[PDB]
């Protein structure tokens, strides 16, 4: 049982999704830009990811720029509420599996929390080899 908060316009998110599929399961796909998690769910995700709230903020997007979020003037809860009100601020992809939750940046972080091994070699879209045919992480 796997969930990915996916952005089809994200190379990182595309590579993650294909690595999930290459382990043999089709995840539930949540298009977070349109269907962001609830506040309770986002708080839980962040806790399980083991990263700070700020570390989840995506830079170089309109609300991060115009809300001045680069400056250290915001509590964690202020940032969480910005994320819910402006879901493009939530960096991507977040993946949930029975083993755990990770912000999969870079995409191959997902290999930590996938239960079943990659079924064959995996190469990212840009040709970066990630696992070879034997299953070794390059
Ligand atoms: Cs939701
Ligand atoms: Cs694993």
């Amino acid at each position: 049982n796997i969930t990915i908060y996916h952005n089809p316009a994200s190379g990182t998110s595309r590579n993650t999704l294909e690595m999930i599929r290459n382990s043999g399961t089709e995840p539930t796909i949540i298009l977070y830009l349109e269907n962001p998690p609830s506040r309770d769910e986002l708080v839980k995700l962040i806790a399980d990811m083991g990263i700070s709230v700020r570390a989840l903020l995506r830079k170089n997007v309109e609300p991060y720029e115009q809300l001045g979020l680069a400056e250290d003037k915001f509590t964690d809860d202020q940032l969480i509420d910005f994320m819910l009100q402006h879901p493009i601020l939530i960096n991507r992809p977040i993946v949930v599996t029975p083993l755990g939750t990770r912000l999969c940046r870079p995409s191959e972080v997902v290999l930590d929390i996938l239960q079943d091994a990659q079924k064959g070699a995996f190469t990212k879209e840009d040709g970066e080899k990630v696992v070879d045919e034997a299953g070794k992480r390059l």
Side-chain angles (χ1 to χ4, degrees), residues 40-52:
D40 283 349
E41 302 169 341
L42 181 51
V43 166
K44 184 172 174 217
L45 293 171
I46 289 164
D48 291 350
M49 285 186 280
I51 66 177
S52 69

Side-chain angles (χ1 to χ4, degrees), residues 99 110-115:
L99 286 181
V110 74
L111 297 171
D112 288 7
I113 54 173
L114 292 173
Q115 292 173 292

Side-chain angles (χ1 to χ4, degrees), residues 45-112:
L45 293 171
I46 289 164
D48 291 350
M49 285 186 280
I51 66 177
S52 69
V53 175
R54 173 171 287 278
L56 183 58
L57 293 171
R58 186 164 174 88
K59 307 182 180 178
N60 202 214
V61 297
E62 188 163 1
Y64 186 97
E65 296 153 336
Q66 294 177 345
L67 296 166
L69 299 192
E71 311 189 275
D72 186 13
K73 286 167 8 189
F74 305 91
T75 61
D76 285 354
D77 281 289
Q78 286 171 326
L79 298 180
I80 286 164
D81 286 309
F82 280 131
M83 279 180 260
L84 291 165
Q85 293 308 119
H86 306 279
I88 194 53
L89 288 172
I90 303 168
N91 218 343
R92 72 288 187 111
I94 296 163
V95 176
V96 181
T97 79
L99 286 181
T101 305
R102 297 289 193 277
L103 167 62
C104 299
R105 294 185 79 75
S107 53
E108 68 266 19
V109 166
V110 74
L111 297 171
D112 288 7

